[PDB]
Structure formats: C-alpha cells, structure tokens
Amino acid sequence: TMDEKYVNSIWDLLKNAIQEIQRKNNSGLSFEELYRNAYTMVLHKHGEKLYTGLREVVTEHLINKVREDVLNSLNNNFLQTLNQAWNDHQTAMVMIRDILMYMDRVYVQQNNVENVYNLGLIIFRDQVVRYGCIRDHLRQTLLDMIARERKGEVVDRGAIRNACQMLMILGLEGRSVYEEDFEAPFLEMSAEFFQMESQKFLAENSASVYIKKVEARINEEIERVMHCLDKSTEEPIVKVVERELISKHMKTIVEMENSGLVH
Amino acid sequence: SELDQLRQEAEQLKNQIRDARKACADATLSQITNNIDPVGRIQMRTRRTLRGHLAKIYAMHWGTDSRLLVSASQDGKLIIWDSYTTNKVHAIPLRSSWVMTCAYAPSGNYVACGGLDNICSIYNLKTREGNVRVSRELAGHTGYLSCCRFLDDNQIVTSSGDTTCALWDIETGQQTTTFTGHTGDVMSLSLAPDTRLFVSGACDASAKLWDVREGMCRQTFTGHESDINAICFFPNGNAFATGSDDATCRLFDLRADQELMTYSHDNIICGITSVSFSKSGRLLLAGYDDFNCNVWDALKADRAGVLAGHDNRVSCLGVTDDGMAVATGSWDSFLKIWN
Amino acid sequence: SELDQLRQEAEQLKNQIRDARKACADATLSQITNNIDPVGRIQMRTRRTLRGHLAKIYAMHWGTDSRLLVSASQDGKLIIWDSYTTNKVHAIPLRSSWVMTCAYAPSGNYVACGGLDNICSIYNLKTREGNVRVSRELAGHTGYLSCCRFLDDNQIVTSSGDTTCALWDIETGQQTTTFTGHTGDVMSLSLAPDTRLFVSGACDASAKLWDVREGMCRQTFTGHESDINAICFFPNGNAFATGSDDATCRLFDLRADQELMTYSHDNIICGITSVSFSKSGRLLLAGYDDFNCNVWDALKADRAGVLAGHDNRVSCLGVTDDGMAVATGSWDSFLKIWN
Amino acid sequence: GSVSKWVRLNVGGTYFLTTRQTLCRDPKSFLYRLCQADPDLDSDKDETGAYLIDRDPTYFGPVLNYLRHGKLVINKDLAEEGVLEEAEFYNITSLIKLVKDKIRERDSKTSQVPVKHVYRVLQCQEEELTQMVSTMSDGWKFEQLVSIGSSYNYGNEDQAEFLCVVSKELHNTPYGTASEPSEKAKILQERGSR
Amino acid sequence: MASNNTASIAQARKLVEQLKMEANIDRIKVSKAAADLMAYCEAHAKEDPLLTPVPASENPFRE
Amino acid sequence: MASNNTASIAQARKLVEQLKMEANIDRIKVSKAAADLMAYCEAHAKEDPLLTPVPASENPFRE
C-alpha cells in the first residue's frame, strides 16, 4: 500500500495551515481540510513525526512573534497586550486540539505521552509566563495599579481579571505560576500596607469610627476581589486585613485617651 | 543547547548517588562469615517427571497453593500440571504460538499468557460449565509481552516490548496505570512479596524498581553489563536477586541501593535465564542457558548445589511457594520436580 | 424493631420443642440390646465391576427393577448400567458437564439429570425412535441442582442451591410447590416410600421434612452442625439416616422428632458421603471420603463390616430394591456390585 | 447551513437536510463545529448552500441513524470498516466504541459460532458399539470413533475398547453462553477438579 | 420492607410457624419406636440378602 | 519544545527526579542489611524443606 506521495506535500500544507491559524487567520482556511489532513497523516502511523513537528512549530511560533508582541508595548498597558496574546493563543489552541483528536485517541495511549492541550499550554507557560522579562513587567504593572486602587484610583480592573485568569488557568492542576508570580507579592504588600494603615488609622480616629472604617475596608476588599482580584483569592486577602488591623492591635483598640472600649 | 547543564546536573546527581552507595559500602557479613550455616553440598532427586509437552517449555510459574504449576510450551499451550499426580488439570490451546509468559493468579481462578502477538490473553479457568474460556484480551502493547504478573485478580502488570510496563485493570481492559522510563527492551519483571514494588529488568542491564501506585520508578539498580534475563525478590520484599546474559548474578538491596553480593564462577559463562529464592532465602536457585542449572548459597557466594537432569536450557525455574520442591521448565519438552 | 418479640417467641418455642424431645428421650433399647441378633462379620465380594466410566461417578441410582441403574459421571455422561450383564443400556451425553444428580423414574420411562446449569433435564428414555431424546428442561432455579427425585412421570422434586427445593411439573416446566424454609443450599434429598413426605438436608445442617401438597415444613430435625450430605429413609418411612461433613452419621426418627442414634468411631476421620439401608434396614451403608466404605449394625450402632475396594473415595451408594446387592459408585470411575 | 434551524449536508453528492440538535449530540463532533457560524469552517458552496462532507452517504447512513434514534444497526452487506472510518472522521468516541462492539459481534457470529460446540467422550466396548451409536441421542452429532489397544485378548472385546467422541453444536443467537458465581459450586468444582 | 429490617419479620413469622407445627405433632417415646425398629428388622432379616447368604443359583450376579 | 532536541529536557527532568529520590532514600550499611537478611533466613533455615530434609511421608512428592 502506497500513500506517501501526497503525504510528503501534506506535511508542508498542514504545517503552513497550523502557522496560519496560530497567527489568527481562519476566514480562508478549511476546517474540514485540516481535519482530513491530520487524519490521513495519522492513520499512516506518522504520530511521532507530527508530534515533534507540532511541538516545534508551537514553541517557535510563541518564541518568535507572540513574546515580542507582548514585550513591545509601552504606550499601551502591558495587561491588555498580554490578554490579547493569550486570547489569541487560546483561540488557536482550541482549534488545533479539535484538529488533533485522532492523534489524541490512538498514539498517546500506546506511547503514554502528553496530549495537545496540556502540552501546548505548558509550552505557553514556559515561554510566556515563566519567561522572566514578561513575568517581572507583568508583576510591575499589576502591583502598580493594584496599589493605586488600594490608595484609591479608578483603574482598568478587567485587565487584572484577565491577567489573573490566564495565570491560574495556565497552571492547570496547580496555582503554582499564579502564586509565585504576583499573588504572594501582592499578599505581602497588602500585609505591609495594612500594617501602616492600621497604625495611622488607630492614632487618627476614635475606636467606633475605626471599627466602621475597618468593616468598610473589608467591604472594599470584597468589592475588589469580585472586581479586581480572583474569586478564589477571596479568603486570603480578606484575612490579610483581619490579621493586620484587628487581631494584633487589640490593646490599642480597647484602651485610648477619651475613647476606646472602656469609654 | 541548554541540555549541557541538565546533563551536568544529572551526572552530578548520579555521582552523588555513587558516593552515597560507596559510603554505606562496607564489609559484607555474609561474605566474611564461613562458620554460620555452611549449606554444604545439597543434592536433589527428580521426584516428578511432567512429560507431556511436545515443545520447549518457555516459561513456567508455580501456583500459590504449591500444587498446580502452569507451564507454557513453545508451540503454544498451557498445561496446568497437578504436580503430585502428574495430571493435566487443564491443557488449554493458545490463540497464538510463541508464548513466553505464563502468569498464574493467586486464586487460580485466572491465568495469563502473552507472546509474540503483542496481546495479553487472560483465561478465566473457573466457570459454571468448567470450559476454560478466555476472559479478557489485553490489547494496547506495541511490543511483545516479555513477562506478566498478577498484582491482583483484576489488576495485572505486563512488562512488554517498547520499554512499557503498562498496568491494566483486567475487566475494564483499559491501561489504568501507564509505565515508561526504561530505555532497553523491558524483558523481565518480578514482584515483591509486598507486591507494592515491581522490579523491571531490561536489555539496558538496568533493574528499575517501580512504585506501583503512582506509576513512578522508586529506585534504579545497575550492576550488570548485559540484558537482564530474570529477577527474583528476596522473601522480604526489600531486596532482589538478578540474573542476566552475563554469568554474573547480583543481589541488589533496596535499603543500601547497591549490590549486596555477586554470584559468579569461572565454570559458568552461559546466561542466568532464571533466578529464584528459597522460602528462607538462604539458597539462590539459578536456571542457566547451560542445559543444567545450579544454586548458590545466597549468603556465601558459593555453589550450594547443581541440578543436572536435562538436555536443553532450563528456560524457567520455580521453587514451590512452600519451598518444598523445585520445578525446572526446560527446552527438552519436560519439567523436572526435584525434592 | 418488632422482630424482637418474634425471635423471643421462636427461642422459647425452640426450648419447648427440645424439652418435648428430651421428655420423649427414653433411651434407645436397640443400642442397649446390642447383644441380640449379632450380624457377625459380613464382608461382601464385588461380584460385578461396572467399569466403563472415565470421569468421577458423582451420583448413582438404581431403578425400580433393581437391575437398571443410571449413573452420572463428572464429565456429564449418564450410563444406564445393566448390572446383570454389565451392559450399558444407554450412554447419554449431557449438554452441560458437572452433573451430580441422576434421577430414575419409578417406571424406567424417564430419567432426570441436574448440575451446575440451574436447569434440570428430563430425558425420555422409552421412545419408538430408540435413541434417548430430550423431553423437558426445567428452568427457573438460579441455584445449582443437587438432587432430584421423581414423584411421578409428571411431577419431580428438584433440590438445588438458592435454598429452594421446589416441586416442579414436568410438562409445563412450571414450579408446583416452593419450599423456602432453609437458609443453606438444599444439597440432599430423599423420599419416604409413602412419597407423601420428603425429608431434605442442606448447608444449614437441618434435615427438614416437608409437606408435598402444601408448601409447609412438616418437621425440622437438627442433630448435625455439618452439612447433611446424603439422606435415606428407613424402609418403613418412619425414620431416616443422615450423613454430613463430619465423620458422624445419625439416625433420626419422625415419631420421636429427635436424633435416635449416632454412627461414628475413632477409626474414621472422613465425612459420610452416602447413606443407605438394607432390605430390613438393620444394616446402615455408609460411603466415606475414604476409598473404602462401611456397613454398620444400625440397631447396635456398631460397624458390621468394611466394604473394601476402590482406590479413591466412594462417591455414592445404592442398594437393590430387593436388597440382593449394593452398588458402590466411586470417584475412581468404577462402579462395583457387592454381595 | 448555520443560518436557520435546519442544516443541509452534501455528503458524497447527496443532500441530507437535518435538524442540528440530533447532529450536535456530541460536543466533540465535527458536525458541532459545522453548527456554529464561525468563519473557520466554511464548506458550503453558495450556489448550492450545502455543507460538503468529504465522505460517502453510504456509511453516513448508519451514523445518521445512531444520531437520530440512539442505538444504530449496521448491516453485514456494509463494511464494518466503512462505518468505522466514518465514525473516526466524525470524531465520536461512543460510536467508535460501538463499532468495535459491532466488529466483535460480527467476528463472534461468523468466525466462531453463536454458542460454541460442546464435546463429550462416551466409552463403549466393541460389543455395545452398534446400539449405543444407533441409539445415540438426537441433538448430538457423532465426531469420531477410536479403538483402544490392549493386552486383553489381543486388544479386542475388552471392557474399555472404544471411544465415541461426539459433539453438539448450538446455534441460538440470543441464547449465548451464561455465567454466574456460586460459592458452594466453586467448592465442589475445586474438589472434583483434584 | 426495610422498616422492619428487610422483612426479617416475615422469616421470623415463618420460623415461629414452623415451630408451631413442630409443637403440634406429638412425640412417640424412644424405646417404643426402637421396639418397632427391632420388630421390623427381625421380621425382615431372613429376607435381607446382605446378612443372609444366598446361593450362586439364586442371585442375578452368579447365574 | 522540539527545538530543544526533541524535548529531551523532559527525560532530563525525569532522570534528575529519579536521582533526587534515590538520594532521598537512606543508605544502610552492607553489614547491617546482610545481618538483617541472615536473621530472616536463619530464622527459617531450620524449616526450609530444601535445607532441612523432610520424611518421605510428609512431602507430597514422595508419598
């Protein structure tokens, strides 16, 4: 049985189509064409070649342009650029996995290897999120305007929402990249900011209005965690307030000159 | 190329493993001692002659009741001999010839075989009609099944070609637990009495000890220079003897991560095709590519005895689960039971 | 819940039953008069050897002529031996192996067999075609059949697993009278010569005498803790022997509702596998898991003699309806006539 | 197409007009991607307005039947391989599993025998041979007669003299082979086995 | 019904009933039943071949 | 990443791990392990049917 003649050209055709869809071009391509392509190149038992080609093509597609497209933004906020790049990556990745399900049902089980989706998301994590220059610039922008909102400003909260969302979805099973990138530094900065805020608020206002202000700060933390932080991040940050303003300055609350619990 | 630094770290870790092993390396109490239980010259007589195969006995595995031994022949048929009466409890034909693994379940309710067919056949021996029927055909191995063992009566381990040691849930038929990490062809496999760690001996001279739950290689042992023919855990589930195509058998210890003691002699050059421990573990019975096989004193590194009652290689060796007698599946179409 | 009062009532009713029994216990005079009518030493000779089986002869059963006996072997063939000429009148192959009950009709025109099929087979013996054709299949049981007996050529009781021994109509294949009093698998069964009472033993060690027309347990006898293997009524339909897994055989009396006598020695460790009575019923025929079996002076409770022969356990006993001689169908594929 | 509730598929040159809901039964199906109005999949031609499927309608038949009314039927005049490849192109795991089941059904029914053949070995001496062969049970087929060598009268007229190996073939398709466990039966099987 | 623990009350009822007809049937004393037994055995001993020798011209196994 | 020599860094990662838990596992002296094995074996070297003989009415291969 001879089938290699069209396989030789279909290598190039499918690789070109993969690159074209990866750069967000879908109006001209034929979904059925990519289906039949990948299917015939797979049932001929060329799984390892297609797997290696997909790995390399995705890795260099992310390295060559997407990383630079994220980096080159200076007159626009970093978060929106990274969000657009990640959205385009997801749009390409869903399509690619829809193509390569036949390889995802036969070859992977026999060879005990990774699937398309997890592998490509891992490549994105290692070449975009884990890559240092994007990581530190992202953390800088996030901390910057999260601190402006903390001290009180009107910001683009949806940008931080998309950022945090890609952060803890690109980690898949774990929160590892999200917890190591910005979440723990944010918790530390919140702890320090609330230490200084409690210190200044205690010596400035009476205990009753201080209680009202701290409960309003809890309400604002809830507002932010619905609007500017991740929903699953509700419980840490809130108690970060609770540990810093109340649970460690009990004697300051109970005793004051002309005020306090005794008064 | 960042592979250079990864290789450097791996090399340094391997070196550290070597120094750690050399650190615990000291005088071997068994080697130095010669006055504690010198087993002397032990002789065994053929008590049973299970003639009735017409082809080479390729593999042979005892039963957990130490009465029923399943012997697979080269032509392809499993004879479940009753050892006492030399009677064929079953003589089931094989779907495909060239079978090299015969795995007997502890219950004796299932039997497993596999061959140059890349399919692991599981026959349910016990059924209402009594007709031995195939229970499940495990497919999903692109390499030939090298060895198989029953981790349970619905859970099996199938050391195959393609370096896969895939674990299967039998009745589902799916590869519930996947195993990979060997480089040489996985050609032998053994279970500890604990049955929680399985050792895989490949053609890369490596015995990889695999943590059976998480699908990850607990330990790695490498003392041989040739493909490992067979492995046999100590009766303690903490160490295993290992025979390879070289004339050197090696007792690897899990606690020390190093060869406890070697077993070699300038009168043996043939590969050790099978290794087996007595119930005590004091005697290490080894089947050789030499038509006759031998047995070392497992803690004195000397030949306790020699079993020479064949004409072809002892392709498989197995001592009774109660350690009472030993069966010698050989390529001369016979099995000898020695007591 | 409310089951507590029922179990209390059952407990005190059991106490009442036992108290009535011990009040009835007035010492068996027969064992006391063990010096009257000694049978001497009676050692029979095997005057026939109906060899011609190749499997284990599980159940053997005389016909009503005391000349044709249907014996079922383990492999699933029925041989209708003619003891007078040692000629196989028929050798029926059975669709499913592992048969353990061969039921001869009172008229010799039907035969019945049952095994691990949960389906009884009624085979028309007498037909103008000459060959034995299937008459009916009795389905509805989910437990393995253990013993069946023809009440008529239309009604047959089918003791089986599933704790049921329902009387079944042959023609319609419909159950006639369920009996669900047992908790063990009904494994033995016997008919009194009046055929209005069948007593049946089981895994619950309870010999339950049943009403063949109502579905009610007429009486319950419990003198055993091991599983009642075989049941044989006394020739008067007033008592029945009972063997079990233990090496003890016991005679039970319908009138006395108690274990009348026991049959055991220190010479025996094998359990009773078959019970029978002589023409008078004075001689108790006990087949054993020992190769040999025995005859006991039942009205003296001591062994009358030893029936030797065979090299493997006796599996079933049967005396001729005239008492001329006794057939000992053993697992050595031998059925011998003793006289 | 995707402009209305109905969708017309030009499978192999033949037009199937079907509701999308029966076609969208699998969210991983290629037809699901057909259902959306995304620019990615565009295989309809605007001079006919029908999505072209690069597959035949012959094996599209059973798949459409499965999508319409649950369990499908696959004739043995249509290749199991044809519907197999059809399902693989349509990307439906339940359907490839059912195709595997259908292939197993075909192989069991054809290659072997619905309800296998059961064999028995009657033993008869040469004197008893004629009647018991002639009166051998209806519903059973004779397979082989084998003599028994012996040192008894040169080997003839011996008590064990002949094996009549007979068989019985069952061919009831829904009857199959039954199996169920019974512990007492297990004990008895073990004891009788050895 | 599970309220009465899977209708164990039904089988308890059956057990009590079986004990009911067990109590209903009288008891016939052991010595008298045994006396019936030696009566039958002595009556039929001289017609029981296993303990009464029978000639080779009288059994269907030697003629 | 197949521009990194066919993603061999996964194999390097696995080997680095294997070595890591190899280091994490204790190292017992050869004398200690050998003594333990002697204890176990000699505890059973008076009951080994191959070391200690068995009367030819107790081994089901000589009766």
User: For residue B24, how many other CB atoms are within 10 A of its CB?
Assistant: 19
Residue-range domain boundaries for chain F: 4-63
First-to-last C-alpha distance (Å) of chain B: 61
Q: Kindly state the DSSP code that residue A181 receives in the 8-state scheme.
A: I
Residues of A in contact with B164 (CB under 8 A): 112
On whether the CB atoms of residues C54 and C73 are closer than 8 A, the answer is yes
CATH of domain B1-339: 2.130.10.10
User: For residue B36, how many other CB atoms are within 10 A of its CB?
Assistant: 12
Please answer yes or no on whether C95 and D168 come within 8 Å at the CB atom.
yes
Q: How far apart are CA B96 and CA C198, in angstroms?
A: 54
Token representation of residue A63: 């390295």
Whether B and D touch, i.e. at least 3 CB pairs below 8 A, reads as yes
Q: How far apart are CA B128 and CA D178, in angstroms?
A: 8
Method of determination?
A: cryo-EM
| d(CA B83, nearest CA chain D) in Å | 11
Please answer yes or no on whether B128 and D179 come within 8 Å at the CB atom.
yes
Distance of CA E29 to the CA centre of its chain: 15
Distance of CA A182 to the CA centre of its chain: 10
User: For residue C32, how many other CB atoms are within 10 A of its CB?
Assistant: 12
Nearest CB among B2, B13, B84 relative to F19 is that of B13
Residues of F in contact with B48 (CB under 8 A): 61
Q: How far apart are CA C13 and CA C9, in angstroms?
A: 6
Residues of B in contact with A112 (CB under 8 A): 164, 166, 175, 178-180
Q: How far apart are CA C263 and CA C240, in angstroms?
A: 13
- The three-class DSSP label of residue D72 is coil
On whether the CB atoms of residues A230 and A168 are closer than 8 A, the answer is yes
Q: How far apart are CA A178 and CA A175, in angstroms?
A: 5
DSSP of C103-140: EE-TTSSEEEEEETTS-EEEEE-S-TTSS-EEEEEE--
The answer, for F10 touching chain B at a CB cutoff of 8 Å, is: no
Token representation of residue B114: 């596999």
What are chain F's partners, defined as 3 or more CB pairs within 8 angstroms? A, B
Mutate which: B67, B80, B128, vs D, most D CBs within 10 A: B128
The answer, for A109 touching chain D at a CB cutoff of 8 Å, is: no
Please answer yes or no on whether E61 and C47 come within 8 Å at the CB atom.
yes
Please answer yes or no on whether E48 and C282 come within 8 Å at the CB atom.
yes
Nearest CB among C2, C260, C304 relative to E33 is that of C260
Amino acid letter, residue A37: N
Beta bridge partners of B276: B285
Among B288, B290, B257, CA closest to B273: B288
User: For residue D48, how many other CB atoms are within 10 A of its CB?
Assistant: 11
Q: Supply angle C-alpha D157, D162, D167, rounded to 5.
A: 155
Nearest CB among B27, B257, B280 relative to F48 is that of B280
Token representation of residue B220: 């790695």
Nearest CB among B9, B217, B256 relative to F33 is that of B256
Question: What is the 3-class SS of B148-176, one letter each residue?
Answer: EEECCCCEEEEEECCCCCCEEECCCCCCC
Please list the alpha-helical segments (H only) found in E1-63: 8-24, 30-44
CA separation, residue D92 to residues C110, D23, D83 (Å): 57, 11, 12
Among B215, B223, B185, B181, CA closest to B198: B215
B120 φ, ψ (degrees, to nearest 5): -100, 110
Q: Which residues contact C317 (CB under 8 A, 6 or more apart)?
A: C60, C230, C274, C275, C276, C285, C286, C287, C293, C326, C327, C328, C329
Q: Tokens 């009440």 belong to which residue?
A: C151
Nearest residue in chain A measured CA to CA from D32: A98
Among B136, B148, B132, CA closest to B92: B132
User: For residue C43, how many other CB atoms are within 10 A of its CB?
Assistant: 11
- The three-class DSSP label of residue A61 is helix
Q: What is the CA radius of gyration of chain B?
A: 20
| d(CA B106, nearest CA chain F) in Å | 20
Nearest residue in chain F measured CA to CA from B37: F42
- The three-class DSSP label of residue A2 is coil
Token representation of residue C149: 């007996």
In our burial notation (b when 16+ CB lie closer than 10 A, e otherwise), range A104-113 reads beebbebbbb
| d(CA F37, nearest CA chain B) in Å | 8
- The three-class DSSP label of residue C208 is strand
What are chain A's partners, defined as 3 or more CB pairs within 8 angstroms? B, D, F
C90 φ, ψ (degrees, to nearest 5): -150, 155
On whether the CB atoms of residues C189 and C197 are closer than 8 A, the answer is no
In our burial notation (b when 16+ CB lie closer than 10 A, e otherwise), range B80-99 reads bbbbeeeeebbebebeeeeb
CATH entry 4.10.260.10 includes domain F4-63: yes
Residues of F in contact with A55 (CB under 8 A): 1-2, 6-7
Record the resolution, in angstroms: 3.8
Largest CA distance in chain C: 66
Residues of D in contact with B89 (CB under 8 A): 193-194
Q: How far apart are CA C252 and CA B33, in angstroms?
A: 69
User: For residue C183, how many other CB atoms are within 10 A of its CB?
Assistant: 12
Q: Tokens 């007809």 belong to which residue?
A: E21
Beta bridge partners of C316: C329
Taking the CA atoms of residue B133, residue B136, residue B139 and residue B140 in that order, the dihedral angle to the nearest 10 degrees is -160
Q: Supply angle C-alpha A103, A106, A109, rounded to 5.
A: 110
Q: Which residues contact A184 (CB under 8 A, 6 or more apart)?
A: none
Token representation of residue C72: 């079922």
| d(CA B94, nearest CA chain F) in Å | 29
Among A67, A170, A169, A48, CA closest to A121: A170
Q: How far apart are CA B71 and CA B69, in angstroms?
A: 6
**H or E element at residue C179:** none
Going across the sheet that includes B249-253, the strands are B228-233, B239-244, B249-253, B259-263
| d(CA D50, nearest CA chain A) in Å | 14
Q: How far apart are CA B143 and CA B297, in angstroms?
A: 36
Token representation of residue B150: 């029953």
Residues of A in contact with F9 (CB under 8 A): none
The dihedral built from the CA positions of residue C79, C82, C88 and C89, taken in this order, carries a sign that is negative
Beta bridge partners of B250: B242, B262
DSSP of A146-175: HHHHHHS----HHHHHHHHHHHHHHTTT--
- The three-class DSSP label of residue C337 is strand
Please answer yes or no on whether C52 and D139 come within 8 Å at the CB atom.
no
Please answer yes or no on whether A112 and B166 come within 8 Å at the CB atom.
yes
Q: How far apart are CA D126 and CA C151, in angstroms?
A: 37
C35 φ, ψ (degrees, to nearest 5): -105, 0
Q: How far apart are CA E36 and CA E38, in angstroms?
A: 6
Residues of D in contact with A105 (CB under 8 A): 93, 96
Amino acid letter, residue A131: Y
Going across the sheet that includes C217-221, the strands are C190-191, C197-200, C207-211, C217-221
Residues of D in contact with A32 (CB under 8 A): 30, 41, 43, 52-54
Q: Supply angle C-alpha C11, C16, C21, rounded to 5.
A: 125
- The three-class DSSP label of residue C254 is coil
Q: How far apart are CA C308 and CA C305, in angstroms?
A: 9
Q: Tokens 């997890």 belong to which residue?
A: A118
Please answer yes or no on whether B3 and F5 come within 8 Å at the CB atom.
yes
- Pairing state of beta strands B87-93 and C228-233? unpaired
Nearest CB among D118, D179, D193 relative to B127 is that of D179
On whether the CB atoms of residues B86 and B95 are closer than 8 A, the answer is no
On whether the CB atoms of residues A61 and A22 are closer than 8 A, the answer is yes
The answer, for A67 touching chain F at a CB cutoff of 8 Å, is: no
On whether the CB atoms of residues B293 and B307 are closer than 8 A, the answer is yes
What are chain C's partners, defined as 3 or more CB pairs within 8 angstroms? B, D, E
Q: How far apart are CA B180 and CA B56, in angstroms?
A: 31
